[PDB]
Ligand binder design. Structure first.
Ligand SMILES: O=c1ccn([C@@H]2O[C@H](COP(=O)(O)OP(=O)(O)O[C@H]3O[C@H](CO)[C@H](O)[C@H](O)[C@H]3O)[C@@H](O)[C@H]2O)c(=O)[nH]1
Ligand SMILES: O=c1ccn([C@@H]2O[C@H](COP(=O)(O)OP(=O)(O)OP(=O)(O)O)[C@@H](O)[C@H]2O)c(=O)[nH]1
Length: 294
């Protein structure tokens, strides 16, 4: 499975934060926002990942993350010249996808909770259809809204409905089989002038092949849409990390835990960062007994 992080857009709502910085390089507490959705794909077992951003910002993501070899993965980059919609990811990414199945995650979405990896790995395992993730939000009209029956079968999906049919938003993580690329080429722009992921999902729903995993109330799903919500997301991650000996979305740690890189390789990453707490954390992990790490 391949993965794509869609990490463009103007971040209009966060102005002036986004005048000269990409929204997905802004902090969520202690790390750039993009580390969080990247860590999600990594934990899904996805090792071939394309990062899409603006003509100005794409070089900066590449400066941040590099080609992935440090992390035992492959990262590639592509430019979206104008933010013409989520579903344009599969058009830009057509050559990258090839014949493979693909997951899309939004560069501004933060998922957190116990058992998430197991849901991701199950979605990544599922060779046919589309899997989307529903979450009970306060204002479902702000999002895509998925309506499901008593067995969790999808009945409808609607982008920002005036009268929502459920309280479950469609979060910014989507798993598709290879049909998605041709689907994306055949949808047309909405009233807001975008190629809509909801219309990709509706194509799968027409075929009876849209599947929803519901993320229950024990999961946290944030987006970093506004100044307020961004600060809230930071506060949430700070609470979790302050209490624990473990970090969230520490990419090098995940590379090591997933066996993508060795203890020796992790030491080599930690060395030039020993001047800071992040390096120290990595070095403590690399020297930790292999039994304790398991
Ligand atoms: O062409 C684009 C369009 C958007 N984005 C980025 O993608 C993210 C999502 O965009 P919005 O915040 O505008 O979200 P939408 O209103 O497009 O909502 C979309 O994402 C939601 C989850 O956060 C729901 O899944 C919804 O159904 C889906 O349409 C933003 O960071 C945006 O900057 C791009 O990089 N390129
Ligand atoms: O090395 C890691 C592992 C996990 N995570 C993040 O921690 C959260 C929980 O990750 P899991 O989905 O592994 O659940 P958990 O660790 O609470 O449960 P155990 O299986 O360990 O008992 C998920 O949000 C995941 O993204 C990291 O950020 N880094």
């Amino acid at each position: 499975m391949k993965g794509i992080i869609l990490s463009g857009g103007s971040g209009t709502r966060l102005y002036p934060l986004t005048k000269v910085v990409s929204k997905q390089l802004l902090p969520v507490y202690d790390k750039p926002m993009v580390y969080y959705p990247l860590s999600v794909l990594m934990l899904a077992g996805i090792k071939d990942i394309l990062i899409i951003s603006t003509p100005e910002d794409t070089p900066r993501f590449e400066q941040l993350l590099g080609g992935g070899s440090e992390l035992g993965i492959s990262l590639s980059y592509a430019v979206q010249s104008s933010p013409d919609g989520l579903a344009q990811a599969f058009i830009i990414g057509e050559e990258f996808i090839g014949d493979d199945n693909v997951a899309l995650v939004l560069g501004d979405n933060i998922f957190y909770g116990h058992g998430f990896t197991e849901l991701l790995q199950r979605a990544a395992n599922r060779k046919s259809g589309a899997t989307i993730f529903g979450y009970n939000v306060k204002d479902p009209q702000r999002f895509g809204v998925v309506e499901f029956d008593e067995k969790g079968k999808v009945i409808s999906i609607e982008e920002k409905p005036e009268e929502p049919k459920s309280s479950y938003a469609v979060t910014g993580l989507y798993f598709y089989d290879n049909r998605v690329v041709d689907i994306a080429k055949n949808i047309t722009p909405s009233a807001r002038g975008e190629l809509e992921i909801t219309d990709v999902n509706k194509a799968y729903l027409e075929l009876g092949e849209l599947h929803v995993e519901l993320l229950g109330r024990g999961f946290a799903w944030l987006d970093t849409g506004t100044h307020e919500s961004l600060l809230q997301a930071s506060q949430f991650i700070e609470t979790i990390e302050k209490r624990q000996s473990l970090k969230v979305a520490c990419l090098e740690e995940i590379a090591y835990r997933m066996g993508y890189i060795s203890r020796e390789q992790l030491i080599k990453l930690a060395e030039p960062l020993m001047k800071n707490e992040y390096g120290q954390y990595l070095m403590n992990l690399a020297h930790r007994s292999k039994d304790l790490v398991t």
